[PDB]
Design a protein around this nucleic acid. Structure first.
Ligand SMILES: Nc1ccn([C@H]2C[C@H](O)[C@@H](COP(=O)(O)OP(=O)(O)OP(=O)(O)O)O2)c(=O)n1
Ligand SMILES: [Ca+2]
Lengths: 360, 96, 55, 342
DNA sequence: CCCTCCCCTAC
DNA sequence: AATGGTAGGGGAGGG
């Protein structure tokens, strides 16, 4: 293929001081630098079989909170509210851990739109996207916010039971023990490590072709002093989130912000199941078996339960209780308040590329 | 993961005895510890006999508790399966 | 691997190096020289109590 | 040679059990890494599946704390375990069981976090309690959705399939399609490769466990990261109701003078006095077909096996001679819970 | 006669 | 340190 492929065998993260390969500023507080940034170490193997160490920069853990503002903001009060909540959060966590400004815990706070999952909600909802710098403290921050040890009231926290590595893989369309496709990458100063004779013994024609195609020794290779090798493997590389080509292959559907499904506007939802199905079909082809199919059957179901009548009466009473006094009957075309100026806000998958290093 | 030494299982007694004789003989978590029961004084607790196979084979005068095995381990399941027919294996055992 | 890695195989070597030789063989067996913390009772009780970086 | 044989033998044990390949396949399918397949619990796998599915439709997932889960309503709905008539059955005993009962129910009835409105009683707009969250409802949400809703047997309003197709349904149908293909491929081969059949059986068991723990993400009242007592109560209650409806359907027919003598949460033991064990297969296929056609689309009743000589001792404890197919000649000793299997 | 603790299984 | 639920039965030890 035309991609530097690295299988995701083992993954881990560590905290390090920022460099020019990692972000150093936040949107909410552009004048405050980052004390440290998290990096992800990916231990994998090239298709030729040689092991490789990959350093991933620019990935920060995040969580969502309810937005305290209004949907009528002029895109400038939103920035002020984000900056104020960022400052308050940073001060409160610094006090709890036991102006100024060093940004040791919180990186950036942003406003995004979204549809909550726990319950039936149709309209767009605004959320605070709090990006943290240390993945290990995420549970502590969530607990502090939940019990109202930071703000006046007790907030509800979204997307915190998802681990940092799982969240990163889900965001970047990465699967365990699967290829990570990158268009380009940065190489460490010794391209082929020589622990004992590893460079000489493991050298290969396919490896040489891969290195010639993907390493230029004038731009890809990093400085020895600035980026010393840390891995006990043959090849060590540093990549950026833009380099990962496994993303941009996810299918994003915006159907939950209104009754698009009911109005008629616009099967393999799990991407990994197709590979297993193909493998099984190929494996059963080796036995000269026929093709796979399943015959459906018609069903004459009507399915009233034991207390269906009581439930119907209660639903009628609830409909009477929760309804506007007279007025026009609701319609599927006008129930959601249109022209709400929601296009200015960012969908969660569009907020990910923000704060990326964006190197030359 | 036991409330007390009194509530410990029969295999726990054997494992603890082996640990007492040598501290490196500590079993892993959820590891099956084999043991046998041997003849003893009347009224002795089941966990009091609890002979390990290593101790049972090296024991000069250790005999399997034939009465305990035949009654407790054999009669109840056979009775449960055969009382639905109308017969009990206890009479057959007592006749032999 | 190893049939029982806690009392034997790699666990015996790790314990011996930590006790007698005062050697951190776990760091040497990892795929990263630097940057590697606490005992994991869940791993010991359930599966693979030992943890080597990258393996 | 003692130690060389030990090392080679453990390597061969891992190779024969196909541990590495099976774990690699599971990690590839779920999306978690190699270590987390056997190190972490099932909730991690369910979380990976759910997050990967939900991120594409901009679903923001609630993350309740320990206190929120501890204050969740208790589970009231329980599975139906019929008390057996402890006896010896010389006549053929036809057993029937739904395939993936709870996942099939979740797919068919559109039970999910995202399709639930609230309890049909105590809806008051201002404040509704449902699961581990307290929320509010729009002004005319119920009047607008007066037709495209379904009511769970425990009294929880769910959106119909016409609007808000559930994500749990999507992941479950993908998993169940893979499992059905695996099972049909395994059944299509007879004695050609015993090892291949064993590997396929392991795969289908893993997929079934994945579906069951996807159901069990809810009802995780203890050590649950995002549970919902109402959703699990609805699933269990409609499973019990489906089982009771199947019992009534089978016992109502006068062509077969058959009575249900025992039944698990989804299984169904039907006694056929003096039916020659060759009419039993046809009768059981007919009952399975009728019950399947009397239920929603994903719900399906399988014929399973026939216990010609059988003994029902107690609940979750029986033994009998199994005849999976009419072409089978030598019965398979099938025992559940009795001293032979413990 | 009844209760508690422990082991293991079936869904 | 991490953990998905439900129900069911039997045996040893102590009252
Ligand atoms: N470990 C398990 C086993 C079962 N169940 C629940 C959910 C299942 O829907 C139901 C019935 O389980 P079965 O073992 O009968 O299996 P399934 O019906 O899910 O599938 P299949 O019949 O294909 O084996 O019990 C569960 O929650 N956890
Ligand atoms: Ca079933």
């Amino acid at each position: 293929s035309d991609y530097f492929r690295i299988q995701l065998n083992n993954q881990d993260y560590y905290m390090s001081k920022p460099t020019f390969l990692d972000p150093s500023h936040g949107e909410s507080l552009p004048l405050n630098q980052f004390s440290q940034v998290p990096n992800i170490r990916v231990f994998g193997a090239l298709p030729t079989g040689h092991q490789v160490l990959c350093h991933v920069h620019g990935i920060l853990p995040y969580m969502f909170i309810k937005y305290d503002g209004q949907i009528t903001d002029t895109s400038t009060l939103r920035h002020q509210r984000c900056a104020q909540v960022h400052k308050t959060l940073e001060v409160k966590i610094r006090a709890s851990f036991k102006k100024l400004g060093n940004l040791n815990f919180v990186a950036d706070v942003s406003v995004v739109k979204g549809i909550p999952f726990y319950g039936y909600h149709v309209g767009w909802n605004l959320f605070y996207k709090i990006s943290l710098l240390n993945p290990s403290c995420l549970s502590r921050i969530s607990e502090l916010i939940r019990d109202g040890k930071i703000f006046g009231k007790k907030f509800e926290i979204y997307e915190s039971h998802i681990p940092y590595l799982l969240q990163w893989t889900a965001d970047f369309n990465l699967f365990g023990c699967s290829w990570i496709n990158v268009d380009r990458c940065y190489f460490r100063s010794p391209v082929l490590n020589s622990i004992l004779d590893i460079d000489k013994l493991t050298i290969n024609d396919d490896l040489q072709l891969l290195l010639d195609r993907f390493c230029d020794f004038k731009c890809n290779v990093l400085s020895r002093r600035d980026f010393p090798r840390v891995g006990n493997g043959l090849i060590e590389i540093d990549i950026l989130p833009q380099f990962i080509k496994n993303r941009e292959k996810l299918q994003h559907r915006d159907i939950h912000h209104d009754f698009l499904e009911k109005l008629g506007d616009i099967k393999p939802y799990v991407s990994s199941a197709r590979d297993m199905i193909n493998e099984l079909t190929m494996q059963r082809e080796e036995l000269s078996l026929k093709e796979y199919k399943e015959p459906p059957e018609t069903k004459r179901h009507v399915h009233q339960w034991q207390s269906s009548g009581e439930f119907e009466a209660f639903y009628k009473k609830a409909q009477h209780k929760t309804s506007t006094f007279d007025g026009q009957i609701p319609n599927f075309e006008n129930f959601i308040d249109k022209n709400q100026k929601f296009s200015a806000i960012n969908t969660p998958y569009e907020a990910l590329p923000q704060l990326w290093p964006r190197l030359p | 993961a036991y409330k007390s030494e009194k509530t410990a299982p029969a295999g726990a007694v054997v494992v603890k005895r082996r640990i007492n004789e040598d501290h490196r003989a500590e079993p892993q978590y959820k590891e099956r510890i084999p043991y046998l029961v041997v003849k003893g004084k009347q009224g002795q607790l089941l966990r009091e006999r609890c002979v390990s196979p290593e101790e049972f084979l090296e024991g000069e005068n250790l005999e399997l508790d034939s009465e305990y095995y035949i009654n407790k381990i054999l009669i109840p399941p056979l009775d449960r399966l055969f009382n639905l027919i109308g017969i009990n294996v206890g009479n057959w055992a007592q006749e032999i | 691997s190893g049939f029982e890695i806690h009392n034997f195989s790699w666990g015996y070597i790790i314990e011996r190096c930590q006790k007698i030789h005062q050697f951190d063989i776990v760091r040497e067996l990892a795929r990263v020289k630097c940057q590697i913390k606490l005992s994991d009772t869940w791993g010991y009780a359930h599966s693979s109590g030992i943890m080597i970086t990258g393996r | 040679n003692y130690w060389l044989s030990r090392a080679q033998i453990n390597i061969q044990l891992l190779r024969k059990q196909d541990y590495i390949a099976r774990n690699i396949e599971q990690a590839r399918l779920i999306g978690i890494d190699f270590h987390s397949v056997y190190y972490r619990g099932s909730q991690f796998k369910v979380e990976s599946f759910l997050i990967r599915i939900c991120k594409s439709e901009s679903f923001i997932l609630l993350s309740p704390g320990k206190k929120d889960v501890r204050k969740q309503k208790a589970l009231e709905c329980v599975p139906l375990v019929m008390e057996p008539e402890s006896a010896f059955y010389k006549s053929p005993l036809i057993v029937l069981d739904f395939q993936s009962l709870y996942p099939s129910i979740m797919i068919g009835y559109n039970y999910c976090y995202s399709t639930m409105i609230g309890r049909v009683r105590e809806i008051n707009l201002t404040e509704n309690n449902l699961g581990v969250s307290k929320f509010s409802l729009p002004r005319n949400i119920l009047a607008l959705l007066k037709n495209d809703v379904t009511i769970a047997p425990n009294g929880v309003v769910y959106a119909k399939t016409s609007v808000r197709k559930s994500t749990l349904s999507k992941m479950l149908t993908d998993i169940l399609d893979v499992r059905v293909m695996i099972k049909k491929t395994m059944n299509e081969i007879g004695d050609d490769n015993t090892t291949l059949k064993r590997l396929l059986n392991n795969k289908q068991l893993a997929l079934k466990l994945l579906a069951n723990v996807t159901y069990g993400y809810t009802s995780a009242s203890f050590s649950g990261r995002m549970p919902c007592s109402d959703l699990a109560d609805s699933i269990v209650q409609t499973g019990r109701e489906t089982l009771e409806k199947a019992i009534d359907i089978i016992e109502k027919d006068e062509t077969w003078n058959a009575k249900v003598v025992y039944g698990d949460t989804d299984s169904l033991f039907v006694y056929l006095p003096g039916k020659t064990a060759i009419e039993a297969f046809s009768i059981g296929h007919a009952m399975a077909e009728r019950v399947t056609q009397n239920n929603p689309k994903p719900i399906f009743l399988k014929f399973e096996k026939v216990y010609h000589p059988s003994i029902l001792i107690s609940k979750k404890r029986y033994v009998g001679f199994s005849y999976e197919s009419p072409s089978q000649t030598l019965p398979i000793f099938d025992a559940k819970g009795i001293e032979t299997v413990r």
